[PDB]
Amino acid sequence: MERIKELRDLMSQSRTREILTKTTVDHMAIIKKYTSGRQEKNPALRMKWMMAMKYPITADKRIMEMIPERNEQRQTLWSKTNDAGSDRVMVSPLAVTWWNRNGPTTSTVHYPKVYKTYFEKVERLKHGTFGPVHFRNQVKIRRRVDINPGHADLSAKEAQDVIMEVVFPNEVGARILTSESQLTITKEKKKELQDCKIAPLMVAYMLERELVRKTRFLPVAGGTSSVYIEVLHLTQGTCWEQMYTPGGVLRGFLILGKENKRYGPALSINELSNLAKGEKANVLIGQGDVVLVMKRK
């Protein structure tokens, strides 16, 4: 298949083979920072020039199935061309507009669930009340203020564990797998996002914004709660202050050792549920560690 063949091609070259065999997973992120080339200068001018092109956007081959080649006015929405990396077709913004006005509708029930923080902001602003504006000399005072309140019970690393369990179940490390009990929030989010077609990376980012506490060192002259820091641009200025009130199963495993070929091919984390109470098995955990483990008895 494509990915294994690309891996073999990379391992054919001496230098890339050297990197792959030498670099451990721990250091992968480090070499992720060794970028080449340069960054575009004047990206705004580049985008303006691109928008004048007939087909400046990249889509996938699937767009041929539903989006027609031309609209009523005979304007060509997409053409036949590739990006030299994959079967990415070149399309126009007319295709985006045509999808928005005629594309297949779906049920957007997960969007309020996934983007809970944004809709909470919308509700807080919607039902808020304003008071007068007071002009005076402003005495700002610096403090740490919660940009994101996060879950009160969950910590930062514990929130990351929840996110990993929810979004990437078969990439959880030994700490999650060897734990004894699962958190209620984990089961709640699992049930909530059972059948969600939004990108898992976006879901992970949203869960991070919702559960992880983030704090910033800011100067304030009033309310210093999470609901008040988001409307800071609206409530304070150089010499004015605006009175506002906001309107609002896979656990209990013990690592026995490294991979043991006599116990069979390595398993996935999801298929550890079919092991008996005590049965030993090789399993891939984390980001590629094959370990022989077993259930507690």
Binding site: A44, K48, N137, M202, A204
Partner: protein, 694 residues
Amino acid sequence: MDVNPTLLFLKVPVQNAISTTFPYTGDPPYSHGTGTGYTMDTVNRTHKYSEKGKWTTNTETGAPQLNPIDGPLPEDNEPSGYAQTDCVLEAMAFLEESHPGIFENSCLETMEIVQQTRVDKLTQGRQTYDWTLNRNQPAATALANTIEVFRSNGLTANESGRLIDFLKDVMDSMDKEEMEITTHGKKKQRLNKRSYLIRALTLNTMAIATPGMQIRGFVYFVEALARSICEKLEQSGLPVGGNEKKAKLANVVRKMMTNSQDTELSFTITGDNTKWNENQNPRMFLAMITYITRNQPEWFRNVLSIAPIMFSNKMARLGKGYMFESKSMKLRTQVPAEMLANIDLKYFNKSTREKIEKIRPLLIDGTASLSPGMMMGMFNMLSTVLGVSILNLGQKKYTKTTYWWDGLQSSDDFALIVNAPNHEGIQAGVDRFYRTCKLVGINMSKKKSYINRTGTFEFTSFFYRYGFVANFSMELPSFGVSGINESADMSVGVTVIKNNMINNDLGPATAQMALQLFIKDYRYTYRCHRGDTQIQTRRAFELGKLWEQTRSKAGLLVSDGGPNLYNIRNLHIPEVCLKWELMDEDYQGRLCNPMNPFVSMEYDAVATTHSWIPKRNRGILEDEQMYQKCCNLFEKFFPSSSYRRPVGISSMVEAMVSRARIDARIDFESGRIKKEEFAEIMKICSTIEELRRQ
């Protein structure tokens, strides 16, 4: 009637209309004031302010080096580089005495930082001088080139992933008798010990100068220590910014004026220290680092001293050179600065002639030897520490007189406030502060400095007047489209306006006008005008059809031809969520359908059909994307690597192979791939395993 805008100052005080004195909102279109001549000028000026020091010849590079430390005390008011070691050490000692435990705690914090740092930290810099290519390159490219050359020269410690091990590799490379550079079919160059040393000790001129990779990590550690020191100093203007500067200006004025008695006299100097880096000696920085790191583990002191040690033997690259032209036949040519040391002196003007004669004895293999002084932008916070120490020397317990001073220092400006019984005491205090600054090598700009009764002053483009501070240290940012896509552009525009309001003192009406200008630019760029309008564009027909079809036009995004609902109230709200309640159900479902064929500063944006990816248009490493090609193909084996930094013991290839085998087995056992595909994948995995074992 001749219009004279500055006559407005006859009524409005200068502080209230200071904005009218700043000509540009944005970088001006000339970017002039640099070149080889300017580099020669700064080198000559630095050597002239120290000329009464001791001359030596470096035993490792042969570079002439001037040492003004402990030189004769100045007799005039011209800039001097004769810092006294005892005076600097005494200033550090008194700063420690007035802030007991400051150096020890800073050292502990920097020790944790030094132990926990990673090599990729060096990829976060700006244009850096690559010695492997002898030219400026991006930080990541230069770091990768250096790592490749070190590997080809048998230097590997940096493979541990720790910056300290990369620095150990740099130290080891300094001992290499020969350095081999291979350029890509192949071209081999050999640098002897002296050539590599000089190359590793250069700062390239095109902050003005740029160092190479061999000093960046040491400088980073030294600046981390300086940051720790400065965070504990109330008189330091760094690293805080925004309204923190306002608060500390107010605090210094309050403490110097309110505390004073009814008969005490208070004055304030708005003082400039322009070009005071020329008289900042690396040896004095080594002295103060040595004093700071007293009673610390020897390795920590070794690193922290290695930084100034390298800066002491630094070399300056002259740059592009000169351009010659002829009128007889209209000829032109470029003369590099490398031949500038062995050329006649009739092709240049008089002033360039004098520059060349002045700098010739310092030239060593295309670089000028510059031991004294520093270049701006490297040890800013250490210089802030020195200036704050001199400010701390202004307490009554250190002056032993009736006058006393206090102020603010930020490495590019200073503000002083002197209290004394009468005018004579104010003069005496000013003289004492100036003379102590001279003792520690700090030179004050008399032309750009001025004094007046406390109540109004300036500091780092913050203008204080009777308690009201106007912040004008930053320019208005660009309010046009960023250029990622419709969703990202809208989110970034609103977020930029909001953050400028929060931090850059952007006014409400100015914020509204900026929002209007951004919306105009966005509509022009993405051809997403209101749709009810009659602007003719290739996207006009579809937008008009969508506008006629829809029932609630307020729910349409601006990219879909909807109206702009953004005001100061909702700049913090994503556009999709802002008008989610007003959207038509069918339009909302189409726009937010995850199965669409388009979707593939931290800003908040919902993933919609407008999140498309635009068309992408388009040394020491044979393949420059080698590391990216490896890191990609790992994310499609472990998607979580995109969100979380991966952790594991096994090598990348072994992890990918194990994942491939497991996935192939699982997908074959579910009737998703056939026997032939399973056999092919297993065979390829076996081939990869053999390759890794080979």
